[PDB]
Amino acid sequence: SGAIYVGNYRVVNRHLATHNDWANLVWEDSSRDLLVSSTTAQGCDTIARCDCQTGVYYCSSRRKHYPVSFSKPSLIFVEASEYYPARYQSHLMLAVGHSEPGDCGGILRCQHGVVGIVSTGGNGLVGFADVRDLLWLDEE
């Protein structure tokens, strides 16, 4: 689990979005595993605006932060988890690292702020849904 809180926005994995998230839907993309809902309380997170390929992610299944090198956001085929089947995901970044289902929502961060959230895993890789393209998260 886990979310990003920036202004009046909550960013979550689309597959973990709550009834409240969907009731206050701002934007969702099934291909990206992202949903943004509106919040009454102002969030304090900063979204990274950059093309860093290094950062640190929180891995709840190890209660540890790991430094990783990660690929630029791409269209990637993802093999069978349990929440999703096998299928294709856009704006996805991979690193070598530990990821289990419940690690989704772990934040990946660089010096510039939040890069993305854990979204996929398995075969010794971790996949992160990029948010750095969502410039609109930084206003109203």
Ligand X SMILES: Fc1ccc(C[C@@H]2CCCNC2)cc1
* 44 marked among binding-site residues: no
Q: Considering the candidates 21, 59, 91, 104, report the single residue annotated as catalytic.
A: 104
Residue 19 interacts with which of ligand X, Zn ion, none, CB < 5 to 8 Å by class: ligand X
By three-state DSSP, how is residue 33 classified?
A: coil
* 50 marked among binding-site residues: yes
Q: Considering the candidates 15, 29, 65, 98, report the single residue annotated as catalytic.
A: 15
* 19 marked among binding-site residues: no
AA letter at 130:
D
Indicate which single residue of 109, 126, 127, 132 sits in contact with ligand X (rule: CB under 6 A). Answer: 109
Strands (E), 15-84: 25-29, 34-44, 54-59, 64-69, 74-78
Q: How far apart are CA 90 and CA 96, in angstroms?
A: 19
Cβ nearer to Zn ion, comparing 26 with 52:
52
Q: Are 32 and 89 in contact (CB under 8 A)?
A: yes
Number of residues that bind ligand X (CB under 6 A): 6
Instruction: Confirm or reject binding of residue 56 to ligand X (CB under 6 A).
Output: yes
**CA-CA-CA-CA dihedral for 126, 129, 130, 133, to nearest 10:** 160
Residue 48 interacts with which of ligand X, Zn ion, none, CB < 5 to 8 Å by class: Zn ion
The catalytic residues are: 15, 33, 104
Annotated binding site: 50, 52, 110, 112
